[PDB]
Paper text:
We determined the crystal structure of the double domain Head protein, the first structure of a multiple domain segment of [name], which reveals numerous interactions between the [name]α1 and [name]γ domains, and shows specific structural features of the [name]γ class that differ from the published [name]α class. The Head crystallised only in the presence of heparin, as found earlier for [name]α1, with the best crystals diffracting to 2.8 Å resolution. The overall shape of the Head is rather compact, with the CIDR1γ domain folding back upon the [name]α1 domain, thus burying a significant surface at the interface. The interface between the [name]α1 and CIDR1γ domains is stabilised by several charged interactions (D367-D654, N381-R518, E389-Y521, Y437-K550) and, furthermore, a significant hydrophobic surface on [name]α1 is buried within this interface. In CIDR1γ-VarO, this region (residues 496–570) contains a twisted antiparallel β-sheet composed of four strands (β1-4) as well as three short α-helices (H-2, 310H1, H-1), forming an N-terminal subdomain. All Cys residues are engaged in disulfide bridges except one free Cys (C604, canonical Cys(5) of CIDR1γ). Importantly, we clarified the structure of the [name]-[name]α1 hinge region that was lacking in our previous structural analysis of the [name]α1-VarO domain. We show that this region is surface-exposed and critical for RBC binding. Computer docking and site-directed mutagenesis localized a blood group A binding site in a restricted area situated at the interface of subdomain1 and subdomain 2 in the vicinity of the [name]-[name]α1 hinge region. Importantly, the blood group A binding site and the major heparin-binding site that we mapped previouslyare distant from each other on the surface, indeed on opposite sides of the molecule.
Rosetting, the capacity of infected red blood cells (RBCs) to bind uninfected RBCs, is a [name] virulence factor. Rosetting is caused by a sub-group of [name] adhesins encoded by the large var gene family. The extracellular region of [name] comprises multiple adhesion domains called Duffy Binding-Like (DBL) and Cysteine-Rich Interdomain Region ([name]). Nevertheless, the rosette-forming [name] adhesins described so far, namely IT4/R29, Palo Alto 89F5 VarO, 3D7/PF13_0003 and IT4/var60, belong to a specific sub-group called groupA/UpsA var genes and, interestingly, all four present a specific [name]α1-CIDR1γ double domain Head region.
Residue numbers in the entry: 19 to 716
Write the structure that this text describes.
């Protein structure tokens, strides 16, 4: 049981000491002399100068140690983009195919470019192809400016920045930037921000010139059997020589009390004594620049997930569970502390809606996070298999080999190290214990986002709230007693969207099936019945692991269904859109689309029939009918509603009356009751399928 960073470092040294075992004969041709660097910006060119640095990397200024001759950056800043807050809880990683090398749509496995990498300080490196950049020295000073300013940003933005304890976290983030800078220099970096590829294109042009500048012996050595230059080899070395200098400009801003720590294969403690992340100590305390990018990134992803999850949960606790301050709420937004409870009062607006707002958000993050953990898990397998399979060579092989030689042969053994990370391990509560080998619990929706205990809670002076049993029994029950038209139960099954199915798949398979329209559908068999003055719904097929609550109110259920309907309606309108396009364009694949929609459409039509069947078992007062409940919900949720529906405003004020059914509520003297938004939305969507069905027919 060791940390993933400690292990990846231990493997890294074995690679580093292998590089320095051999004494480079051409070392002096690749070692850069800072003082010797030549830079020319727009003003420098205007005024007719060539700026040089002094000895100190710590006295480097972007206004003079840059080649930036562009219009956009007149300030000549190394950080010029969305490089504002990388440690933000809402800062996103990138896992798609377009902006990553090796990540391709087809293969489900993908590496995740952390926010910190996405916004590195290399805008000055986009300027490397020019008449003044032709030496090992020039290049170093460019890497040196980048390292300084990037190292600055990390220190003046870090969460541990003001921390009372040890500032170890700052060094760790620098080590991450250092390694990423290295992979950039080397040509090894996988992030492709734009097809322009200016750092990499320029970085090529520099090394081509460095190569010609070399001696015949050195040129012959850094060459390919065909005579061509082994630019790859040239570049990995240039990094090994210069890396000490790159670590100085980086740690140039690091605080006195920040020290890079790491443990040995045995368990020996390695620390940077002098301080400032080992700034005045020479040789770097890190070997992370000798760890493949993917692993560094995965270890970063895990460590940031664990960190932000603590922030996210705390924001959820703030709106849903602060018993010390008489706070207790449902994820369906109801104050459980209340004497007279809003959760069984169907027409009543919701008290505590900030809780529901927090839960929806938290859930959406945890599922974004889950998708990333799935993608990376698959790539770790793709990479750990690749080493045994391929006979030929690539730079990473040697590392992945060693990893398999340690117990970390498979994903499960490695995910154990991810659990042991500084942030992931730090939990004195087994409620929020992180086990990446238990994706179910670790990617679960918070326990604070559960429905109110049906009877409510009564808070105490002691700083906690207690679950009351059969609370306020028959108190003001005389009023709703006459409003009970049917006390029999009503059973129906509902097709809830469970998108956590693409990932987790082996664990879910049994309970969640993928539909045509969704990569996950959860069939919930409900029994709704009026007991006392509260209509409770029981989940027949209840599974704690996958379903949140066993018992809910009918009001809670309706709104869940209504949330789900809109979502599904949106998805449907989306999948049917190319076929619906007015132009009489024949498409074969369109037939299977409309059939899919009809599959979901019909299910819901059948679903709602049963839900109205339960609604009508109670009287809420004339005009306080389901058509009005549907409007009330759609009004109070105008954001979501506008994203799903085409013209809500015309629908909201649409008066269509239908046959008055068996529905006890219909007390209208032979008059026909008005169609609800749900029924009109379905019956409208239907006509759209009927059109498509006959617009792609043989
Ligand atoms: Mg690609
Ligand atoms: Mg299926």
């Amino acid at each position: 049981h060791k940390s993933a960073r400690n292990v990846l470092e231990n493997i890294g040294i074995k690679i580093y000491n292998q590089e320095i075992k051999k004494k480079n004969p051409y070392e002096q041709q690749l070692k850069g002399t800072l003082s010797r660097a030549q830079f020319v910006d727009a003003l420098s060119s205007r005024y007719g100068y060539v700026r040089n640095s002094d000895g100190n990397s710590c006295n480097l200024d972007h206004l003079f140690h840059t080649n930036i001759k562009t219009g956009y950056n007149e300030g000549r800043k190394p950080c010029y983009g969305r490089e504002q807050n990388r440690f933000d809880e809402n800062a996103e990683a990138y896992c798609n195919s377009d902006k990553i090398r090796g990540n391709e749509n087809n293969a489900n496995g993908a590496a995740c470019a952390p926010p910190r990498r996405r916004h590195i300080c290399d805008q000055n490196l986009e300027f490397l192809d020019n008449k003044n950049t032709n030496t090992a020295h020039d290049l170093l000073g460019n890497v040196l400016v980048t390292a300084k300013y990037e190292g600055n940003y990390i220190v003046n933005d870090h969460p541990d920045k003001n921390s009372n304890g040890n500032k170890a976290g700052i060094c760790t983030s620098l080590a991450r930037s250092f390694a990423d800078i290295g992979d950039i220099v080397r040509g090894r970096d996988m992030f492709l921000p734009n097809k322009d590829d200016k750092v990499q294109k320029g970085l090529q042009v520099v090394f081509k010139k460095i190569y010609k500048s070399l001696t015949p012996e050195a040129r012959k050595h850094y060459a390919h059997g065909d005579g061509s230059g082994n630019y790859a080899k040239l570049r990995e070395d240039w990094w090994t020589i210069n890396r000490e200098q790159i670590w100085k400009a980086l740690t140039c801003s690091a605080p006195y009390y920040a020290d890079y720590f790491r443990k040995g294969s045995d368990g020996t403690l390695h620390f940077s004594s002098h301080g400032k992340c080992g700034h005045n100590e020479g040789a770097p305390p890190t070997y992370l620049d000798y760890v493949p990018q993917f692993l560094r990134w995965f270890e970063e992803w895990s460590e940031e997930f664990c960190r932000i999850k603590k922030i996210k949960i705390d924001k959820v606790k703030k709106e849903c569970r602060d018993e010390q301050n008489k706070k207790y709420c449902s994820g369906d937004g109801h104050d459980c502390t209340q004497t007279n409870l809003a959760h069984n009062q169907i027409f009543v607006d919701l008290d505590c809606p900030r809780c529901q707002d927090q839960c929806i958000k938290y859930n959406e993050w945890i599922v974004k996070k889950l998708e990333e953990f799935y993608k990376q898990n698959l790539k770790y397998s793709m990479e750990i298999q690749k080493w045994k399979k391929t006979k030929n060579n690539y730079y990473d092989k040697e590392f992945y080999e060693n990893l398999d030689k340690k117990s970390y042969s498979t994903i499960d053994k490695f995910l154990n190290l991810l659990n042991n990370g500084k942030h992931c391990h730090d939990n004195k509560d087994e409620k929020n214990k992180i086990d990446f080998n238990k994706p179910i619990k670790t990617f679960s929706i918070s326990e604070y986002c559960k429905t109110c205990p049906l009877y409510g809670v009564t808070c105490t002076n002691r700083g906690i709230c207690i679950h009351n049993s059969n609370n306020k029994n028959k108190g003001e029950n005389d009023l709703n007693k006459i409003n009970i038209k049917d006390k029999s139960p009503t059973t129906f099954d509902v097709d809830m969207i469970y998108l956590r199915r693409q990932y987790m798949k082996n664990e879910l398979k049994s309970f969640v099936e993928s539909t045509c329209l969704f990569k996950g559908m959860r069939n919930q068999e409900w029994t709704c019945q009026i007991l006392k003055n509260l209509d409770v719904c029981k989940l027949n097929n209840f599974n704690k692991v996958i379903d949140i609550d066993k018992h809910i109110t009918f009001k809670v259920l309706l709104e869940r269904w209504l949330k789900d309907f809109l979502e599904g309606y949106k998805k449907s309108k989306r999948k049917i859109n190319p076929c619906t396009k007015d132009k009489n364009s024949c498409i074969k694949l369109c037939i299977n689309k409309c059939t899919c929609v009809e599959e979901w459409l019909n299910k819901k039509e059948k679903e709602w029939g049963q839900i109205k069947k339960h609604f009508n078992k109670q009287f809420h007062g004339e005009g306080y009918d389901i058509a009005f409940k549907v409007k009330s919900y759609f009004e109070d949720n105008e954001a979501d509603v506008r994203k799903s529906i085409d013209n809500f405003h015309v629908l909201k004020n649409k008066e269509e009356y239908e046959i008055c059914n068996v529905d006890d509520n219909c007390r209208s003297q032979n008059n026909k009751k008005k169609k609800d938004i749900v029924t009109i939305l379905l019956k409208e969507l239907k006509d759209k399928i009927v059109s498509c069905k006959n617009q792609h027919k043989a």
